[PDB]
């Protein structure tokens, strides 16, 4: 079994998750919706590539049972490729506030210096957000079911291998296929949050030690709850996915900055989290 301490660690994590993860997104409202030179050209060309394969349609199911569906525009002149960014900015900001609250209730996080808490959140915001999004991702329909809101991937010619190209999309399918428990997701969030190698951390020693504790807890949880040889390397697969997610985070953050540079749209909280002066 798990040590008493490990049991307490998981309980605190689950408590935090339940208190700060609005899984039905019932409190997400008041958000925006799409309405109804050489160097510069080079910037735009890269920006178009940064989001041409991350397109989603949006669906809103009203209380009365009506349904609004929004299909994004095809990559044309320019501007139209940013039609959903304001909305996305609102959804992610909503998620980030939930992630900040999550960290705040964790005793291990509170004891850290305020400057370190800030550094850890900046480094892991995107990661924790995507880990939570994975729990509401329906791999059968390629849709993130967020309460009344739904974001569906626009399938193309290729299809599976087509999407598998985008690292973050492949990540969601792969992670979903592991069929993790709430406990494993929350431990993944903790390992990501307490990354000692985030740029700006001062208490490297303490953070590294905390991460290891969380990792050993996850490894142990798996050993105790799934002895089946089929899960022999589950822990290592998870740790490998977290390392990948970290690379994906850096890459999307760069994407954000590139877009921001030619089409500012980040909310105030996003500017702080991803280092945008604005």
């Amino acid at each position: 079994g798990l040590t008493e301490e490990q049991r307490m660690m998981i309980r605190e994590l689950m408590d935090a998750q339940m208190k700060t993860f609005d899984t039905t997104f019932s409190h997400f409202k008041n958000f925006r919706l799409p309405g109804v030179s050489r160097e510069e050209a080079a910037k735009w060309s890269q920006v178009r590539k940064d989001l041409c394969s991350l397109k989603v349609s949006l669906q809103l199911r009203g209380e009365d049972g009506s349904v609004w569906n929004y299909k994004p525009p095809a990559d044309s002149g320019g501007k139209e490729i940013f039609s959903l960014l304001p909305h996305m900015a609102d959804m992610s900001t909503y998620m980030f506030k939930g992630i900040i609250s999550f960290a705040k209730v964790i005793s291990y996080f509170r004891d850290l210096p305020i400057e370190d808490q800030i550094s850890l959140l900046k480094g892991a915001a995107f990661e924790l957000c995507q880990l939570r999004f994975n729990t509401v991702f329906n791999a059968e329909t390629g849709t993130w079911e967020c309460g009344r809101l739904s974001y569906c991937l626009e399938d193309t010619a290729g299809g599976f291998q087509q999407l598998l190209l985008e690292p973050m999309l492949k990540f969601h399918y792969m992670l979903k296929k592991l069929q993790l428990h709430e406990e494993e997701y929350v431990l993944m969030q903790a390992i990501s949050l307490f990354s000692p190698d985030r740029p700006g951390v001062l208490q490297h020693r303490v953070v590294d030690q905390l991460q290891e504790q969380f990792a050993i807890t996850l490894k142990s949880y798996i050993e105790c709850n799934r002895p089946q040889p089929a899960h022999r390397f589950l822990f290592l697969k998870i740790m490998a996915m977290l390392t990948e997610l970290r690379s994906i985070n850096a890459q999307h953050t760069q994407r954000l900055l590139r877009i921001q540079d030619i089409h500012p749209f980040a909310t105030p909280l996003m500017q702080e989290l991803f280092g945008i002066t604005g």
Partner: peptide
């Protein structure tokens, strides 16, 4: 300087 450059985050973490 870090807190100075992240007032929102700082505020959210102290409540």
């Amino acid at each position: 300087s870090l807190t100075e450059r992240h007032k929102i985050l700082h505020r959210l973490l102290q409540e």
